[PDB]
Each structure stands twice: as C-alpha cells, then as structure tokens.
Amino acid sequence: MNLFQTVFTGSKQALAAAEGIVKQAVDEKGRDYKVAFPDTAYSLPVIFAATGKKITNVGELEGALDIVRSLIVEEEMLDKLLNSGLATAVAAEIIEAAKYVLSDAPYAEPCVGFISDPIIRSLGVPLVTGDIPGVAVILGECPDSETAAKIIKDYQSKGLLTCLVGKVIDQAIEGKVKMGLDLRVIPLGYDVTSVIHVVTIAIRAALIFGGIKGGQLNDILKYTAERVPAFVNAFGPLSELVVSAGAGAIALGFPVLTDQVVPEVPTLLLTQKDYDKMVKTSLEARNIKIKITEIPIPVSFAAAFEGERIRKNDMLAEFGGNKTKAWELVMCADQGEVEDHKIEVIGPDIDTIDKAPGRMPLGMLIKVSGTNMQKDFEPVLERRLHYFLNYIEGVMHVGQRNLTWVRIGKEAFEKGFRLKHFGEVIYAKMLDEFGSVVDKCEVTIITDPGKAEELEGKYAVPRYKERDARLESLVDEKVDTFYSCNLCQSFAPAHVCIVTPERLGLCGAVSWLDAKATLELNPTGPCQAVPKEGVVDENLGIWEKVNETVSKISQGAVTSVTLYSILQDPMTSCGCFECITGIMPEANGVVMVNREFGATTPLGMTFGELASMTGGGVQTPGFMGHGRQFIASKKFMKGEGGLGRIVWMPKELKDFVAEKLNKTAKELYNIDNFADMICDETIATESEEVVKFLEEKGHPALKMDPIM
Amino acid sequence: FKKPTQKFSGKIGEVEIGTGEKALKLGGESVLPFYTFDGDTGNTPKVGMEILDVYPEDWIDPLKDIYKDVAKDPVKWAQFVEEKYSPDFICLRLISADPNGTDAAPEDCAKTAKAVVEAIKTPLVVAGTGNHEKDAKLFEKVAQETEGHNILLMSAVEDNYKSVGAAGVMAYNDKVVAESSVDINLAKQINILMNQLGIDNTKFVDNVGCAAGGYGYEYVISTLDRVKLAALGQDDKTLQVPIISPVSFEACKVKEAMDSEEDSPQWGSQEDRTVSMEVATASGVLASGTDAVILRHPKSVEVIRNFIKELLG
C-alpha cells in the first residue's frame, strides 16, 4: 500500500466512523437537536472554513457527511491526496461535534477537548509577536515515558506551545510534565480525532486574525501555511487513519515528522528515528527560530562600554598590532561546514598568561551559513564585529582585516572571562542583528602562532582579494538593479540618491554593495531596488524605470533625471556632499571645490555660497554635489565629455585623488599626469588667469566640443 | 482670473472609533483641510478632552479648581467631562503605568480602564506611557479588559507595533494609533509594517508627532503638509490614513503655559496663557491636516469647536 492508498484508506475509515457516530446522534437526540462547540462563533470551524456554512442541528451534521464524501477522489495526484487529508479533518470534526451532542462533557481532565475562541485570542498575540515560536502537535506514543517527557519539555523550554494526542498524554504524566495553558502543554484527547482541536486553532487564526471569510478555503490554507508555525510529531506505529490525518496537516502546510518508516516527501513528510534530534529536525522543517535573550558571558555587555580606556598598566593580554599578528574574517560557507553554536579556542587560553601583560597571536574565524547569505554581505557582518567586541567591558577592538588588535583588561579575566566568551558574544548577536540572513554561525578563536599564520593564508588573505576585486571591477553595465536612498529627505524632501557601482552616495558613506545589504536586512528601509529596465539614452544615463522610481520616492517633485550628466536634468543634492563641481563656461569645463576649502573658487563663489543653491534637493543644471570618490570614476560626467572637463581643484583635494584621477584619465589616452595639467589654488584663483594656464598646458577640456 | 482648479487623485480613508450613536468618523477628505471651496472635506475634525487615571498633581491650579470633587476617581472624572463639556472623545492617559514614576502593574491600569469605558457613551482613547516595552504589556491587558467598545489604543511605535497591533486591531477588534517621529518616511514605514502584518488602513490612524508652538513646531507642520500632499496629490495608498495629534500632551507642559503669576508677573494670567497655548497649537495643526486633537482645558475645546465650525459652516 503506497502513500496515496494509505491516505485514501484512512479517509474512508474516518468517513465510516463519522457516519456511525452521526447515526447514534440521530437515533438518540433527533435531527432537531442542537449541534455546537463550547464557546465559539465559527460553529464547526473546519466546515465553516471549507464551505462557509454554519451547522446548528443534528440534521445538518448528517448533511455534512457529503462534504467528506466529495473530498475523497481516489486518483493518485497530489491535489487529491491533499483533498483527502482535508476529508479526514472534516470527518474528525464531525466525530468531535457528535461527541458533544451525545455526552454533555465528553472530555475528562487532563484532556481539554475543544479550545474556545477566547483562548485562541489569548494565545493569538504571542503567536503574532513570536513569543510562541511554533505549535508542536505531538500524537502517538514514544518508546518510553522519559523519551516523551524529554521531547515535550524541550519544546516547552523553547517557548513553543505543544499539544498532545494519544498515549503521549499518559507518558508525559508519567514523565511529570506540568500541563496547562500557561505552561503551554495542552492535552487534547486520547483519540486521533482530537487532533482536530488544534487544527481548528489554526483555522480560526485565519478567521480571527487573518480576516478571511468562511468558504475561502484556499485563502485559509494559504494563511495557515504562511502564518501558523505548526508541525506534527507522530510517534509510534501509524495507522492509515493517522496517515490520512497527517495528510490533512500537510494540506494546511504543516510538515509531519515521524519516527516510523514512511514514503517521505521532502519538506512535508519526514522520518527522524533519532529522538535526540527530533526537536531540532522539526524546528528546521518548520523554519522556527528561537531567540536568546541573554549573552552567556559573566562580564557586563552594553553599548555604553565601548569607547572606554584600559589603563596602560591594567591590561592583561594585547593581541595583535605591530606587536603580533591578529586578524578577523567572516565567511559565507555551506550549511555542511557550519555547525550551530560551536566555539573553538585553538591554542593557549587567557588563563595561561599569568605573568606580566604580554602579547599572543589572535585569529578570529567566523563561519556563517544561511539560505540567502551571499558573499556581498560578508563585509557588513565583519564591520559590525568591531562594535560587538567593543561593547564588552575591559575589551576594546580597533582595526580591520589583519590590521586589528584587541587588548583584554584585568577586570574581565578575574570575572572568569575566557576566549570562549569571545565566540559567545559574536554568535549570540550575529543571529540577533542578522536574523534574516544568518541561519548558523560557527566561531573559532585561534591563538596558536603556527595555526594563526596558516589559516590567514588560506581563508583571510584570499578573501580580502575578492573584496577588493569586487569593489574595483564592478561597473554600471554589469549590474542590473540600481538602488535608491532617501535618508536625507528629513531636510531635503525632494532628494533621492540613485546609487550605482560607479556612483556612490553624495555623503560617501553609502555604496552599491552597502545599499544592497541594507535592502536585504531592512526591506522597508531607506534603500530600495531600482530596476535598470528601459533605456531612453545610454550615454546620458536616462532610463524609463529610473524616472518612474524617482518621481515616486520624491513624491512627484523630480520627474526626469540623468545619472551621467550635469546639464540635462541632473541629480539633486541634499547637503551632505563634501565636494561640489560647478560649470565654468569660459574654460569649456567645470571647477571643483571641497567643503573644507574656505577660499573663493574661480567661479567667484565659495563652497558655502555654492552649497546654498546646489543643495536642498533642487535640480540645478551646471552644478552637482557629489562625494570625494566619484571624482575619479569613469562615469563622472560621461555625458558631458568625460573626466577631462575638470580644470580647477583645491591643492589638498588634488593630491588626495591624484593617483586615482591620473589612472582614470589614462583611459582617455592623454599623458598619465592629468593632475599636473589641472590648475590649483596656488597657481591661480581668477578666471582669466586659469584660462591662460590651460592654454599653455594643452588642457584637453579646451579642445573638446562646447559644453554649453 | 482663473479659479484654481486643484484636483487630487487621492482620498483619506475613514476610521470609526467607538460604538453606538456617539461613534465618530475620521478622515474622508479629498482636499486640503478647510478647503470647502476646493471639494469634499470628508468628516469634520474632532476635539477630545484628556483625563488621567490618577489625581493631576502637575496640572495648573485653575485646572485643579475645575476638577475638584471628580479628579480623584477616574470613573467620576470621565462622567463629569462627558455631561458638562460633551467632547467628541475622551482620552484616558495611564500615568500610573509609566516606569519613570508611580510604576504599577498592567493589570491594575486595565481594571481602571474597564470601569471608565463602561461608564461613558463617548468613544474612549486610551493613551499609554512613553516606554515602548511597558506599552506592549500594558495594551495587551487593556484591550482584553475593554472588549466590545472599539477603543483607540495610542502610541504604537515600530518597536511594539507587533505586540500592540496584534493585541489591538486583530485580536479584540479595536483601533490602534501608529506613531512615528515627525517624518514622512518614518510615517510611511510604520504604515507599511501595519499593512504587512494584516491591518489595512481602515483599522489604524496615524500620529506623525506633535509639539508645542515654538518648540519644534515647524517640524510637525512640515510633516503634516507633506503627508497630506503625498496622500492626495500623489495618491499614496500608504499615507491615506487619518491623523490624530495630542495637543494637550505637549502644549500644556511648556514654561509659557505653566508658569504662574508669582514666577512670571509680567506674563499675566496663567489660565489665559494655558488656553492660548493649546488654541494656537491646535489651530495650526488642524490647518495642516490633523483630523482629531486632544485638549485639556475645557475653554480650549469651546474655542477650537467654534474655530472648526466657523471655517466649515
């Protein structure tokens, strides 16, 4: 008997039991006798969800058997199997309803039977806020009472609401599990049909919290699959009826886990014989995550402790610096290589250096795995690691990559601080902040001189290569989505920053990679994806989608924009820009000036005067506020001739970008020393003087076509 | 000349607070506030009065003289305000719940709120404390005790929106105020989070922040202007929600309104400055796009109600 035939057989047995008990209700109470569940507004929830009909009398209960019959179509296709599972759920509900009709109180304590609506509203808020990570539906019998008690109390200690069906109720009592609604251990009943009482909890969750009307069965099934984190642990031998009821749980999107050999279906029906791993298997199968409130370190942990100073004579261990080699690395590895919450200290511990304050090598290798964790998010995780270590009292971390060094104070060590606590801080809050991209985190602290050098050359150094190559070699043509930031709209309402790999933010603190990770960590945050679809003009940077997404974010203030030009519909500026480039018509080029420069530009206006018109989120042709890195970009005024339009820069500014500016101008084929041709403040400050300087220098900007 | 034909494609949604014949409607306008000459102003802005669950110790002496024999018992206080001033709604601020002062368990405060809601006909707005952590527990118990009256839970910030929204709109069928900090993007963000959680625009109102005149007031004015223009001019579906701004919370705590004649003899009367401070603050936010204000002094309510009536009729 295959899976489909087992489910069909179980559904038929459920129908047979429903017909028999309905016949008893008709013979003893008549078709006019009332049918109801104690304290609910949804009548029989499963039938109300599936059909929208409320059943009030026994005669209608007998007419509900046709719903079960119409749900059993014996054709071996997945949809029929799910419908047959729902047939078992409807039949089980009819059996439970007839129980209340036949006997006034059909459940005796500890069994609670039906769960009233006020209880659902009572536990609904923890279900939405995640205070209840999931619902563990445990039915059947474990090999022994202690096995059941261990699994049940493991779920209870994790905050999950566990419901019990069958002999596990007695096994848990023998195992001394404290059962209650406040204790989140609810025994429903000894019969298999009592599992419908937790099914109606999920059904009414859709009815009450999802606001889905009765009869919208597909919407209700979609709701329970996405919103209700329920799963089934079926222990002991499974009859056909149990399997068909499990098909009902699968129909609601609840995966079924069992210790029995079954025809496994990936993500839906799974066999796990190891009772020591059943809880972890179920949490993974239902995507349930349990949060850790407390960092398990004796030393106090707070954001206030960063920025402290350890006395020069009250240090204990000084790892790294020019003294010894220390490094850090965050890796994106496969789930196989990362084991959750593994802290490894390789080499002598902090308790070994009892002598005067000394130095030891330090290697902090962090392995991170996740469903949607990629290599572009590694720098973001590694940047935050600096503040994670500084938040600990007596521990201060400064530096990145192999340029890091961490000093430990005496205060922490006397309170039992060890190198293992270093991995506890990272792991506990790596899962906290990066809770949507990090599934498992594995931290190894290396302090052996031999291994610290070896692991750097195979993990650290090669991965720093990829970071530098990715940042340098990424251009606008390769990427397919841009990003838009609107965090400066608090004072420039009409300002939208379009971030491309060759054009970062005006403030200079947001780049294409940073905005990519901001969107992933904070989907509703300031950075949103901008598709690069619809190309009106390639040279000027005009895109159909960019204009659409700029008029939406700016609330219609700016409708048409260009990315590679300063004359035709330029980008807006907020006021965080450090450098502003202004057009100089008499020189057939543009002038630049940085914020710190307090003198007068050849344009006749200082930085403050120019910032009063460029900023504020207004489109001013001819003037553009940008970052300090955008100067040496290949897209710096691509549509206005290119990089060679620069004719005047401050002396301090010219030196900073001289190496990068010269390299970029080399692609323009002119002599490498382009900065030598650029005039500076020292040479001249007036328009007529700088033009003469450009005439004698053979500056390329003069020979180009007229900019204006 | 040419009469300005300003056509807005958006329309603010309606939120109903309370039950019975005294229930009030917010929003519904498709034009700027008081622009009866441009089109349809949906619902007239409402004016509410503030009470406390404890005796008002920091209120001005003229206010203490009004609420002499009724301030001790919130149930008596709520009935006194309803029968004497007939406010559109009554705001019950749970001062006893804040951890910064006479911190009390959420069960105690919800019991006080239960008696008040069952002793008045007017819709009730239960204002929480400033603490985000306490408001999550406070509103869970309050919304449970006061079930079936459609109260308005206030100050549900991004931190506790999951807890307040679930225990509010979804569970016990109440209304929730989604509060942001004087920003359109932050206001737009919190509304999106409520919508994703399963709460559409008809079940929550917006609080874009409030301030007293002269104390960061232009920031509130700009935010109100921006959200109104985006909701109507740009047909932004995530901002088409009514706005409630508590004026008495901020306008009545300033030096210019609390100082008595002993402290500042030149400033004149204290009651006049307290009323004049709330009237100026409320009138300015009403003109900027606020659909409901909360006032403390009874005289401020009469002036604002006359102010609303004159402009609309």
Ligand code: SF4
């Ligand atoms: S300048 Fe920087 S912070 Fe401001 S909006 Fe642009 S990307 Fe965001």
Ligand code: NI
């Ligand atoms: Ni900016």
Ligand code: NI
């Ligand atoms: Ni700026």
